[PDB]
């Protein structure tokens, strides 16, 4: 292979049980998911984040 590739376990994609098509419930559950995933990844990596609330 002229371009060496790697096996990359990709990023977690947000998946809600009931998709309500409006932005209110979506934004609530999405903020929760974002904070949770940021915490998980900060635990995985040797780094820190700013603005996590």
């Amino acid at each position: 292979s002229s371009t060496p590739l790697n096996w990359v376990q990709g990023p977690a994609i947000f998946h809600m049980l009931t998709s309500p098509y409006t932005q209110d419930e979506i934004i609530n559950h999405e903020m929760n998911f974002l904070k949770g995933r940021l915490l998980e990844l900060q635990e995985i990596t040797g780094k820190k984040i700013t603005g996590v609330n």
């Binding site: 009931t18 998709s19 309500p20 098509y21 409006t22």
Partner: protein
Amino acid sequence: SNIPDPTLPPTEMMTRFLHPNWYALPTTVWLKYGNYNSWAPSFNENGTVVD
């Protein structure tokens, strides 16, 4: 077992069930700019299903 007796409430299944066919799709917004502001954008239709 932990299964309760069939005579203990509640006893209904679809008490808080919502089918996607009623999920309140997005539509126009209908902004209101004062009273004498007629040269103003009245709608805001960005992610609407119908015009």
